[PDB]
């Protein structure tokens, strides 16, 4: 059983720039090495086989090289759609084993998030719970902190956070924050504020509301 090992485990670079990722077989495989690109939510797509041979249709940014036990992948002209996880698989004798992947982020210009708060739907209130949602979409870097100030006091309990993966159409990041409490506690306070702390500002981005006022 061969052990493919990749490096670095992640990496980012502007579009236009070039980057090389490497792979390690734990045994001499020959030129029996394939390379795939995966965009999260999607299936692996072929780029290279026979260590250097270019997959049918694959763009020429992609160059494959190496033999024996150490191989590499180079993308010149980093395009925005080359983000994703990259993987190497030996194709020498069974079982074909995959490397652990390499995460490629695409540096781009910064962007402050577009914060927007939404209150509990009446439908949910009816039921007996209340979730306040906040979307802070399309921002750059991926680093972002959101505080929840339930009437002014911050609350650490009741928050579920989720982040998409780098968008392709723009190279930016997005994320959701969800504060869920009961309509008892919900109706028992008025100010609901969502606050994003991001590098693009020294002052957080606050978005709020009045339970009581509409």
């Amino acid at each position: 059983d061969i052990q493919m090992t990749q490096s670095p485990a992640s990496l980012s670079a502007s579009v236009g720039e070039t980057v090389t990722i490497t792979c390690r077989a734990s045994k001499n495989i020959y030129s029996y090495l394939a390379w795939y690109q995966q965009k999260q939510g999607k299936s692996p797509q072929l780029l290279v086989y026979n260590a250097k041979t270019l997959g049918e249709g694959v763009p020429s940014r992609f160059s494959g090289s190496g033999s024996g036990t150490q191989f590499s992948l180079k993308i010149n002209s980093l395009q925005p759609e080359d983000f994703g996880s990259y993987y190497c698989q030996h194709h020498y004798g069974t079982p074909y084993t995959f490397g652990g992947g390499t995460k490629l982020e695409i540096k781009r210009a910064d962007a402050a998030p577009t914060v927007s708060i939404f209150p509990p739907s009446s439908e949910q209130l009816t039921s007996g719970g209340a979730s306040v949602v906040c979307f802070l979409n399309n921002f750059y870097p991926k680093d972002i902190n959101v505080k929840w100030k339930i009437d002014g006091s911050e609350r650490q309990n009741g928050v579920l956070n989720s982040w998409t993966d780098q968008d392709s159409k723009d190279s930016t990041y997005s994320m959701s924050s969800t504060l869920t409490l009961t309509k008892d506690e919900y109706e028992r306070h008025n100010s609901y504020t969502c606050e994003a702390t991001h590098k693009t500002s020294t002052s957080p981005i606050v978005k709020s509301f009045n339970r009581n006022e509409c």
Binding site: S31, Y32, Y49, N50, T53
Partner: protein
Amino acid sequence: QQVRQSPQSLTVWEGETAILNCSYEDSTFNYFPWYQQFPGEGPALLISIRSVSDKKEDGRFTIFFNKREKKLSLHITDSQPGDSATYFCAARYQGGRALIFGTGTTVSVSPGSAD
């Protein structure tokens, strides 16, 4: 059938020419070797042709190749009773460890048959 050949049985008077045909569907198989097999013995290479070449010769044996059209044929220019055997058509994917074999044609030389 990744590699296919026709005919599957050709009986021919000695002196005569034989044409064995063959084609493949996977465009970038690059080496096309033919093989000969005499009753009771292991298949033995006969003639071969890299993909970058239209013709190939060895005295009486000759391959004519059609990359573009993914076509190939074997002509046994002069037939003698010694040529009776099975001729497999074959192809290999570049970088490959194997031979993907046609179904083979059974050529018979000098008949009124039973050789």
